[PDB]
Amino acid sequence: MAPVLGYWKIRGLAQPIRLLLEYVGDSYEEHSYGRCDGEKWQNDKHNLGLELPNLPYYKDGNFSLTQSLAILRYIADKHNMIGNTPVERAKISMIEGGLVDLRAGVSRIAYQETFEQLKVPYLQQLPSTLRMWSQFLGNNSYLHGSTPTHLDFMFYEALDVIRYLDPTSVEAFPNLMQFIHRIEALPNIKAFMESDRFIKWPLNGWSAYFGGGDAPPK
Amino acid sequence: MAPVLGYWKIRGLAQPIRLLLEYVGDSYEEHSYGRCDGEKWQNDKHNLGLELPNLPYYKDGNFSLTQSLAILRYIADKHNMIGNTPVERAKISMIEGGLVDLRAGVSRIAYQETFEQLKVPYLQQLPSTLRMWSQFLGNNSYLHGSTPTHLDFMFYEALDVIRYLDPTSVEAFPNLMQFIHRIEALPNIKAFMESDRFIKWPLNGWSAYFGGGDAPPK
Ligand SMILES: N[C@@H](CCC(=O)N[C@@H](CS)C(=O)NCC(=O)O)C(=O)O
Ligand SMILES: N[C@@H](CCC(=O)N[C@@H](CS)C(=O)NCC(=O)O)C(=O)O
Ligand SMILES: [Zn+2]
Ligand SMILES: [Zn+2]
């Protein structure tokens, strides 16, 4: 029993978890719920031994978790990526909470039918948010320490999503673009990206008005 | 000199931090931004040494953090509240994420002009959420381990806020009410709640449609 990751067959909250596992080279299986599997999830939700049922979930033996960040952190912790003193642990948790905000800012407008309207002040406020991340990353290859951690895969997925939303916003910060290309060049990430099990779309749940549907628009 | 906790003069995301610090008896001072201090925060935000500027923030000498969860976990980690193995650290991060969701479900509708309409389905789904938390707590005095941790203050505040939104929803689970009373009976929490330092209102920012304004309604 390789561990199992359960989620919708979408990028969403689980994509940084899959990227991480692929990068560290850990075996896993996914239990994927497709667009028509709503009732199948409602059926399983309370039968999986989960203390706080939710998606995504992660199960390994008799151990189980929910909460995307707790699953990411469990895998990161096993690879020594969560820090080694109180000050370092807390800095990593601060960066995580920032990256969850960066990805959620998209999600919180993407499901509204007024998305095209909400996008306007969203795009007016985004340069200041991107500037803050650009300054924080500065000339570093990765967000914390000298090698990839779960924070880089959260950050990569948020930037790739935002870039899809408005490419000129992210292209305005050379270090953010270079960071996207850096993560995509990692040998295990490039292999995962080129493989049949990669999910390139949708970014959000299928019913979203941005980053939803079965296929990219056009 | 004592650490500084900076936030709006509202309960919001900082209240579980103030509860935790009063419980463990750590000295702290608050830098409180009032209802008309918005420009004062805009003027401070980039001039406080913060790597990822936001509210709340925490500063102790040249150490600083933002992200309410990271600040809570910093304090909690100094009091050995974040667990002692990867499995136990992960379980605590899971319960944190579910409590962040529990509090955010109120914030996500409270600031919207359509709050009164959104409240209907929110109150339709709330019982199942509270039932999950009621079964998770079960007959335990606290959410994890045998003594209060940052998880309990997060959970207390989210329940008190929800209780204000719909008192009988929470009162339908006696063990959640017993937990609210148990946290309020802790001598250091009672002394805080009876002091001049305590903020009982507003629950969200003053401009919210629910839990806003300068005093509770009617
Ligand atoms: N705080 C959460 C959110 C989890 C979540 O919102 N899950 C949505 C999918 S993005 C869901 O389908 N949950 C299943 C359910 O509520 O039954 C975490 O990061 O995992
Ligand atoms: N993920 C965050 C959210 C922080 C946030 O939304 N803060 C709001 C107040 S509740 C704010 O006024 N931030 C200051 C700003 O936007 O400049 C955390 O938990 O601290
Ligand atoms: Zn490994
Ligand atoms: Zn202390």
Determine how many CB atoms are found less than 10 A away from the CB of residue A107.
Answer: 17
- Structure-token pair, residue B13: 């995301």
Q: CB–CB of A164/A103 below 8 Å?
A: no
The C-alpha atoms of residue B96 and residue A49 are separated, in whole angstroms, by 19
Asked if residue B8 belongs to a known ligand binding site, the reply is yes
The C-alpha atoms of residue B75 and residue B69 are separated, in whole angstroms, by 10
Contacts 24+ apart (CB under 8 A), B105-109: B105/B129, B106/B158, B106/B161, B106/B162, B106/B165, B106/B203, B106/B204, B106/B210, B106/B211, B107/B204, B108/A108, B109/B210
Q: CB–CB of A97/B68 below 8 Å?
A: yes
- Structure-token pair, residue A100: 């969850």
- How far is the first Cα of chain A from the last one, in angstroms, to the nearest whole number? 41
* Exposed/middle/buried for residue A177 (C-beta within 10 Å: 0-12, 13-18, 19+): middle
The C-alpha atoms of residue A167 and residue A39 are separated, in whole angstroms, by 36
Instruction: Find the angle CA(A154)-CA(A160)-CA(A164) to the nearest 5 degrees.
Output: 145
Chain region(s) in chain B for CATH 1.20.1050.10: 82-186
Specify the 3-state DSSP secondary structure of A141. coil
Q: Measure CA A122 to chain center.
A: 20
Give the CA distances from residue B48 to residues A42, A93, A166, B4, B60, in Å, rounded to whole numbers and listed in that order.
Answer: 47, 20, 31, 11, 12
Determine how many CB atoms are found less than 10 A away from the CB of residue A157.
Answer: 24
Phi, psi of B36 (to 5 degrees): -105, 15
The C-alpha atoms of residue A27 and residue A24 are separated, in whole angstroms, by 9
Residue showing tokens 């999910």: A199
3-class SS string, chain B: CCCEEEEECCCCCCHHHHHHHHHHCCCCEEEEECCCCHHHHHHHCCCCCCCCCCCCEEEECCEEEECHHHHHHHHHHHCCCCCCCHHHHHHHHHHHHHHHHHHHHHHHHHCCCCHHHHHHHHHHHHHHHHHHHHHHHCCCCCCCCCCCCHHHHHHHHHHHHHHHHCHHHHHCCHHHHHHHHHHHHCHHHHHHHCCCCCCCCCCCCCCCCCCCCCCCCC
Specify the 3-state DSSP secondary structure of A46. coil
Contacts of A90 (CB under 8 A, 6+ apart): A83, B65, B70, B71, B73, B74, B77
Sign of CA dihedral B205, B209, B210, B216: positive
Which mutation among B39, B40, B54 tests ligand 2's pocket best, with the greatest number of atoms within 8 A of CB? B54
Q: Which of A31, A59, A29, A55 is nearest to A42 (CA)?
A: A55
Across the interface, of B70, B74, B93, the residue whose CB is closest to A67 is B93
The C-alpha atoms of residue A118 and residue B208 are separated, in whole angstroms, by 19
Residue showing tokens 């270090």: A175
The C-alpha atoms of residue A211 and residue A190 are separated, in whole angstroms, by 22
The C-alpha atoms of residue B8 and residue A118 are separated, in whole angstroms, by 26
Determine how many CB atoms are found less than 10 A away from the CB of residue A134.
Answer: 17
Q: CB–CB of A172/A179 below 8 Å?
A: no
Number of residues assigned to chain B = 218
- Structure-token pair, residue A78: 């096993």
* Exposed/middle/buried for residue B22 (C-beta within 10 Å: 0-12, 13-18, 19+): buried
The C-alpha atoms of residue B66 and residue A147 are separated, in whole angstroms, by 23
Q: CB–CB of A126/A162 below 8 Å?
A: yes
- Structure-token pair, residue A89: 């642990």
Determine how many CB atoms are found less than 10 A away from the CB of residue A190.
Answer: 13
Question: By what method was this entry solved?
Answer: X-ray
Distance A54 CA to ligand 1 centre (A): 5
Asked if residue B201 belongs to a known ligand binding site, the reply is no
Instruction: Find the angle CA(A188)-CA(A192)-CA(A197) to the nearest 5 degrees.
Output: 155
The verdict on a CB contact (< 8 Å) between A90 and B97 is: no
Alpha helices in A6-84 (DSSP H): 15-24, 38-44, 68-78
Residue type, A146: S
DSSP bridge partners of A59: A4, A64
- Structure-token pair, residue B84: 């002692």
The C-alpha atoms of residue B189 and residue B193 are separated, in whole angstroms, by 6
The C-alpha atoms of residue B111 and residue B119 are separated, in whole angstroms, by 12
DSSP bridge partners of B57: B6, B66
The C-alpha atoms of residue B124 and residue B127 are separated, in whole angstroms, by 7
What is the DSSP pairing of strand A4-8 with strand A29-33? parallel
- Structure-token pair, residue A12: 């969403």
- How far is the first Cα of chain B from the last one, in angstroms, to the nearest whole number? 42
- Structure-token pair, residue A42: 């409602």
The resolution of the experimental structure, rounded to one decimal in Å, is 1.9
Answer whether B101 contacts ligand 1 (Cβ < 6 A): yes
The C-alpha atoms of residue A199 and residue A205 are separated, in whole angstroms, by 12
- Structure-token pair, residue A63: 């151990």
Which mutation among A55, A68, A74 tests ligand 1's pocket best, with the greatest number of atoms within 8 A of CB? A55
CATH number belonging to domain A82-186: 1.20.1050.10
Four-point Cα dihedral A47, A52, A56, A61, nearest 10: -60
* Exposed/middle/buried for residue B206 (C-beta within 10 Å: 0-12, 13-18, 19+): middle
The C-alpha atoms of residue B144 and residue B139 are separated, in whole angstroms, by 12
Q: Which chain A residue lies closest to B72 (C-alpha atoms)? A: A90
Specify the 3-state DSSP secondary structure of A9. coil
* Exposed/middle/buried for residue A101 (C-beta within 10 Å: 0-12, 13-18, 19+): middle
Cis peptide leading into A56, omega within 30 of 0? yes
Residue type, B61: G
Q: A64-79 burial by CB neighbour count: b if 16+ within 10 A, else e?
A: bbbbbbbbbbbbbbee
Contacts 24+ apart (CB under 8 A), B66-69: B66/A94, B66/A97, B66/A98, B67/A93, B67/A94, B67/A96, B67/A97, B67/A98, B68/A97, B68/B13, B68/B14, B68/B16, B68/B17, B69/A93, B69/A97, B69/B96, B69/B100
The C-alpha atoms of residue B208 and residue B111 are separated, in whole angstroms, by 4
Contacts of B148 (CB under 8 A, 6+ apart): B23, B142, B183, B186
Q: Which of A63, A47, A14 is nearest to B88 (CA)?
A: A63
DSSP bridge partners of B30: B5
Chain region(s) in chain A for CATH 3.40.30.10: 1-81+187-213
Superfamily, domain A1-81+187-213: Glutaredoxin (3.40.30.10)
Nearest residue (CA) to ligand 1, atom 6: A55
Specify the 3-state DSSP secondary structure of A20. helix
DSSP bridge partners of A1: none
**Chain B contact set for A59 (CB, 8 A):** none
Q: Which of A199, A143, A211, A159 is nearest to A18 (CA)?
A: A199
